Amino acid sequence: PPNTLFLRLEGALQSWGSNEAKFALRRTADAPTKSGVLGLLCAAMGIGRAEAADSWLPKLANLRMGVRIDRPGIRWWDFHTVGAGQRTRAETLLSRREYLADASFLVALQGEPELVAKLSAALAKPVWAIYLGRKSCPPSRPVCEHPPGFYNTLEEALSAVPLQKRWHNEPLPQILPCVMDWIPGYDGEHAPDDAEIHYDLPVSFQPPRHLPRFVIRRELVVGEDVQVSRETGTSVWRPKGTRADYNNSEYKKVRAERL
Amino acid sequence: VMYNLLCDNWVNVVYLSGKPDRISLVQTLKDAHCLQLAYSNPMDRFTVFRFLLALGYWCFANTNVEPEPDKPLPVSWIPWLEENKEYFELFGDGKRFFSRIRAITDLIHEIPTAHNLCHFKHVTDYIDGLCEACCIKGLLRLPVFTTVGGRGIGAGINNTPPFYLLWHANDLAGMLAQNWQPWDNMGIPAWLGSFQKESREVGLLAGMTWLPRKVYLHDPVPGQAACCSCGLPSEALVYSCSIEVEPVPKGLEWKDPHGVYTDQGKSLQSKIKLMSNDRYTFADRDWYSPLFSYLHAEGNSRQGKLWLVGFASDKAKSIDIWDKIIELEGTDTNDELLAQLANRATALNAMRKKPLRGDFKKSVGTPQIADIIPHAENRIAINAGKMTENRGYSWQDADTEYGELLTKVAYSLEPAQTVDARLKRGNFISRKPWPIIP
Amino acid sequence: MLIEIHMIQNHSPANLNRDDLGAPKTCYFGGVLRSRISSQCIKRSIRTSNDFKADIALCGVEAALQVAHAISTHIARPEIDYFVAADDVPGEDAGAGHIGESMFASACFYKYFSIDWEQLVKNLKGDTNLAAHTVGAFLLAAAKTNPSGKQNSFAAHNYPDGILVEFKNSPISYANAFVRPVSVVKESDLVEQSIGQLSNYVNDIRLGVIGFWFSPNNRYPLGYKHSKLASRNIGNLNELVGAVLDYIG
Amino acid sequence: MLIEIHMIQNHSPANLNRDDLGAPKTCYFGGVLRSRISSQCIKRSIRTSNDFKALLGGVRTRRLADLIQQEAGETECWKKAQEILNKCGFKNTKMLVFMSKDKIKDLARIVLDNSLGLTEAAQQVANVIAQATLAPDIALCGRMLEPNDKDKDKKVKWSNTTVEAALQVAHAISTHIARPEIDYFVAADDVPGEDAGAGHIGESMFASACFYKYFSIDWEQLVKNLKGDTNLAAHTVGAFLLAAAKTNPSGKQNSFAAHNYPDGILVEFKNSPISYANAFVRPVSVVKESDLVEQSIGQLSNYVNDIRLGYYDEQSPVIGFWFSPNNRYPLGYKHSKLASRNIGNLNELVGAVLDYIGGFKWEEVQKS
Numbered sequence A: 001p002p003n004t005l006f007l008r009l010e011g012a013l014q015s016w017g018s019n020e021a022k023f024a025l026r027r028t029a030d031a032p033t034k035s036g037v038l039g040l041l042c043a044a045m046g047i048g049r050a051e052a053a054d055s056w057l058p059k060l061a062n063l064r065m066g067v068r069i070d071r072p073g074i075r076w077w078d079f080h081t082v083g084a085g086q087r088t089r090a091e092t093l094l095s096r097r098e099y100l101a102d103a104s105f106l107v108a109l110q111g112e113p114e115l116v117a118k119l120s121a122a123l124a125k126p127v128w129a130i131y132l133g134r135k136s137c138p139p140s141r142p143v144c145e146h147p148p149g150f151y152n153t154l155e156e157a158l159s160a161v162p163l164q165k166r167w168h169n170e171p172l173p174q175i176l177p178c179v180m181d182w183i184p185g186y187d188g189e190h191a192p193d194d195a196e197i198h199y200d201l202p203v204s205f206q207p208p209r210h211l212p213r214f215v216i217r218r219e220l221v222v223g224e225d226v227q228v229s230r231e232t233g234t235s236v237w238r239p240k241g242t243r244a245d246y247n248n249s250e251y252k253k254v255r256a257e258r259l
Numbered sequence B: 001v002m003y004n005l006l007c008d009n010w011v012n013v014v015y016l017s018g019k020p021d022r023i024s025l026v027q028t029l030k031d032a033h034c035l036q037l038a039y040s041n042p043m044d045r046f047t048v049f050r051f052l053l054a055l056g057y058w059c060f061a062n063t064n065v066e067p068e069p070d071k072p073l074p075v076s077w078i079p080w081l082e083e084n085k086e087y088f089e090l091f092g093d094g095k096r097f098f099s100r101i102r103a104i105t106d107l108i109h110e111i112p113t114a115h116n117l118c119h120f121k122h123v124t125d126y127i128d129g130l131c132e133a134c135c136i137k138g139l140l141r142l143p144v145f146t147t148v149g150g151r152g153i154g155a156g157i158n159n160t161p162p163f164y165l166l167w168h169a170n171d172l173a174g175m176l177a178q179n180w181q182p183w184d185n186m187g188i189p190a191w192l193g194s195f196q197k198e199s200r201e202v203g204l205l206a207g208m209t210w211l212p213r214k215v216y217l218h219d220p221v222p223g224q225a226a227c228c229s230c231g232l233p234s235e236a237l238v239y240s241c242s243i244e245v246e247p248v249p250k251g252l253e254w255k256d257p258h259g260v261y262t263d264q265g266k267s268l269q270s271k272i273k274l275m276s277n278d279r280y281t282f283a284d285r286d287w288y289s290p291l292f293s294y295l296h297a298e299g300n301s302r303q304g305k306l307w308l309v310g311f312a313s314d315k316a317k318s319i320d321i322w323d324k325i326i327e328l329e330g331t332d333t334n335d336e337l338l339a340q341l342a343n344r345a346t347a348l349n350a351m352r353k354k355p356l357r358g359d360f361k362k363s364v365g366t367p368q369i370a371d372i373i374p375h376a377e378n379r380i381a382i383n384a385g386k387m388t389e390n391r392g393y394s395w396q397d398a399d400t401e402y403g404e405l406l407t408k409v410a411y412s413l414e415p416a417q418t419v420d421a422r423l424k425r426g427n428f429i430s431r432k433p434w435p436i437i438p
Numbered sequence C: 001m002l003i004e005i006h007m008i009q010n011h012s013p014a015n016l017n018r019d020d021l022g023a024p025k026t027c028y029f030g031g032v033l034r035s036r037i038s039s040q041c042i043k044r045s046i047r048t049s050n051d052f053k054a055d056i057a058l059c060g061v062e063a064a065l066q067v068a069h070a071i072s073t074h075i076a077r078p079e080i081d082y083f084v085a086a087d088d089v090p091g092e093d094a095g096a097g098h099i100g101e102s103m104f105a106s107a108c109f110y111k112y113f114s115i116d117w118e119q120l121v122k123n124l125k126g127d128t129n130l131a132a133h134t135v136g137a138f139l140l141a142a143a144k145t146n147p148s149g150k151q152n153s154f155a156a157h158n159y160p161d162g163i164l165v166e167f168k169n170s171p172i173s174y175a176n177a178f179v180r181p182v183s184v185v186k187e188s189d190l191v192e193q194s195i196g197q198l199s200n201y202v203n204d205i206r207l208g209v210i211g212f213w214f215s216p217n218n219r220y221p222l223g224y225k226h227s228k229l230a231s232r233n234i235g236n237l238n239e240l241v242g243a244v245l246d247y248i249g
Numbered sequence D: 001m002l003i004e005i006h007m008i009q010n011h012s013p014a015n016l017n018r019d020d021l022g023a024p025k026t027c028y029f030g031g032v033l034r035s036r037i038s039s040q041c042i043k044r045s046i047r048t049s050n051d052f053k054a055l056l057g058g059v060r061t062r063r064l065a066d067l068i069q070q071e072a073g074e075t076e077c078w079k080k081a082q083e084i085l086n087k088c089g090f091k092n093t094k095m096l097v098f099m100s101k102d103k104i105k106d107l108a109r110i111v112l113d114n115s116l117g118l119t120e121a122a123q124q125v126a127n128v129i130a131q132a133t134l135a136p137d138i139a140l141c142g143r144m145l146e147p148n149d150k151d152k153d154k155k156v157k158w159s160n161t162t163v164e165a166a167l168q169v170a171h172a173i174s175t176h177i178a179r180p181e182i183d184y185f186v187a188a189d190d191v192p193g194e195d196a197g198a199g200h201i202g203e204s205m206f207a208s209a210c211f212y213k214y215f216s217i218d219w220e221q222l223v224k225n226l227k228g229d230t231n232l233a234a235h236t237v238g239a240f241l242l243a244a245a246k247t248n249p250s251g252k253q254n255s256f257a258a259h260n261y262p263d264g265i266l267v268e269f270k271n272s273p274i275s276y277a278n279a280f281v282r283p284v285s286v287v288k289e290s291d292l293v294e295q296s297i298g299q300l301s302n303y304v305n306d307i308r309l310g311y312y313d314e315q316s317p318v319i320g321f322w323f324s325p326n327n328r329y330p331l332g333y334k335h336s337k338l339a340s341r342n343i344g345n346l347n348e349l350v351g352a353v354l355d356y357i358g359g360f361k362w363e364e365v366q367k368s
């Protein structure tokens, strides 16, 4: 019956690549792409290379999904100087990479509970050194958080999960953008005239060949289904030490011993 | 082997019903109203639509029927395109579509070629295969996106690949219909035989299908068995290409329907460099630059979704490619404000080059200002056409988003809880890009 | 099974990673700007020198490493410099040089490493105990030579103070400990306050393996209680190396 | 093999280094403000020290043609020299050029005056500049040379100008919170007047701090750039030890004659150097007993303890030294009895470190 696991993507840095990167300007998109969480999925099963192209991408390519923005991280650019033939000649190759900094996400994966049941025991224990879509970008939160359950609609699943808070006096996005796929309600349905095309759909893996997909914007305000969570967990150390104990019951009796 | 454009599937396109296939020409103009151009490379989409637009202009010159809106392409083009099967052929004895031998990898500019390096980005010339479809849609980038090959190898019909401004639509019929503006000259397109030089101002279909480089190609004793560079597993693939240079003769007064031209006549290139030199600061995709020559000279203010392609290139180095679907309805224009918008790179570099204190002219300034410029540009540029039309989005309120990243950068820069450090943080906050009248 | 070398590393004032214009590189985390060294820089610094080579299956089957960007435990503090190269031959006036400006930053960093079970066994090279030998080299070779940089003018090779090694298999960086950048209170060190923040995060998450902890002459305890949050408050050079060696096999 | 030399110097109220605005240099080490002395100032003061004069053999000049013209009684070669230099690659009177002094003097004089050419004259002048490595100050501080590619000739080449620095001077970090002090001075007008005021009311900033000074010798690099000889290398190591223990930065010493001497030397031989900056991540706050020097030495010795046991390197032990004059300032006041060769002189530690360098003596080497 639990048809959806809510992937938790959170770290200091993360990047799921966009289409406009063939040359040294390598860029990302403001959403975890389909093959930016399916690569995490394939690593979580412990396989890769050309095995994912068969029976692993089409095994879920018939399955719709939705993503949620807990906080929109800002885009950061890192200088990167490949040394080429230096640790050919000493001609230093040049590049620039795009990094999404301090962004938390929540992906949905809906339709049936057997694959989600296989997948629930894939995030925590089975690994192939999973990261946030970039090899040098660590997931700072337990990815196996937000336990599965039955919520029939995309919005109900995407909004029926508690929303975290790091410190008490922290600004919180009152509108949570939702990225959802296209639902063919009837055969012959044409896409609405606001759905931008994203090119995140692999049919092979190495070397990357791709298919496009339709992405529908959606919105979510807090309060009706989603809500803040308990924070606790004091991030303030200030080394502990008691003081000022005249007597509870064990100073009267303990003064006399050394007297 | 036998190949044909009208018969064999070549263009990767999504359907409005929701299934991307590979289809040939006859299905994509006979349906023409349930599909969209779906290429990973954006200027590749632009090249394929350019080919379709030149084909439509050819069909209009022959059968004389304009494309009416909200109705697929007229049926009077298949009895003009169905009788010529010797026309669009690639291999064999006959005229082809569009000594010196270079690698086939330089034809598709995204794939690295025989550079001055012992190694490339995990590719190697004359080794990695490439399929017929990508070769053929890489030949469409010859007339329109050909760069300088070291000042001795010529370019295309323009000295540098210009900025291309172009109208986008939800429909392929809508794409062809919204960009139908013709001119009285006919020209001589390259799918005919040897073009006649005749007089200058050769036309439109001649410049749409201009050939800066001859391509012949060669096929060895069969070929491969699976893909190695493309990604789509295909049959025996090609090995290498053949290329030569036609020196474009002087003169040839020619203005591009989609091109963006400087007032002095040179082509306008995209202004993106990965180096933040003394005169440049890396910001983002430069949709802002090609607005003066397309909202004042050709097309001007008009209804329809506008699309922008920028392929920056310095001499013979391809550095990036991107796209931008910008919003445009045609509510007139302001000359001066759009002139400031026509180059924000100078303003951004002038804002970056300001140091913390002093007056030296080529000090690097604040280098962490340059690290927050791209996110601010991405936040500004999502409603780039709303900023363009000047309804409620202006320069003076676009920099209001810069304040937050600048507050936290100033928190990093002046880590003192003093009165003075708070004052320098506040003076740091007031920084914003000032417009320039060039 | 997975190796997480959570490492603290203070730095005396010196610039180590330089961007186009020469600044120390920066990251964004916790709603503040923090100093950063690139993962490529520290990963190449782990290579390219023979003291660590005392390893080509680990930074090349591709390679076997997850090295994170060095997130500062506090806010970034970039400073600037001003140098004058003298003339040293008496002219009609004084001063001759480039009269430029340099720039530097002192920060206390954090990083996270990942070496899985098959990611170390299929690394292999030629042995099956090599899957313990190379790791045993690594756990203190990662804290062996600070990268490189402007060391000939900004000499900084400060060895790290507090080193974690965990055998938890679920890959989670403890960067959420530094969601709030570390402030300084007079009775504790900056490194001691950062290690208290790491300890305070350690007492969490276990509510919903072990803690192998390194403190040289145990000056830094992971929690000021007898209920130690690591229970292994020890460490001396290759004692930890051999203990990981017979923890793995 | 590389040598570490550590000092802990307390200084009188002084301004040994300033930025463009005149403030003493500050760095944010350990989350607090620490007073800083620039490494280049220390390197320059040790270069110009009164004991390096037998070894001071490097010149950093843009007026090379002036140097040629000085050593010519009647043969005026200063425009020909200027154009030879201008097509050498330097473009103007030039940029800063590092070389040996006497070598460039005599042999650039002989190679410039002859009327045999103008292009190959510039080429051989450039080769003479590039081969000028017979100087150990260049070998210590390091030198590259980059001429222009525009104002040159296509027939003029440049050899590899690779010279590595055999010295990594650290910036002197204060052992406590920096207390930058503001000095208010006036300038007396010697003649009187109606106003009875100052000629110039000015701003000066001074800082009194206990600086942790830190240097490091790459002796292997010091001989890989000073060719096969070791006599000059040992002489330079001894000269630096004497100079650093004996000279001070030539800042505002005419106004703040702070010529105080290093109250601590720590020489430790190993293949993995260490700064004791983390010995003072905790700021040193003095107590009623002892003084700032003793508390700083105490924290330093605590750090030496847990990096000699917690970070012990008993494969290559410490040969940790002192300059404790007749044991005035001992290190191990509570536990750290690991100072193997605590002495109370300076020439003794010079001779000792050149003894573990090799079979050398202090007086015999002092002739190169």
Ligand SMILES: [Mg+2]
Residues within 6 Å of the ligand: B130, B131, B132, B133, B134, B230, B231, B232
């Ligand atoms: Mg293909």
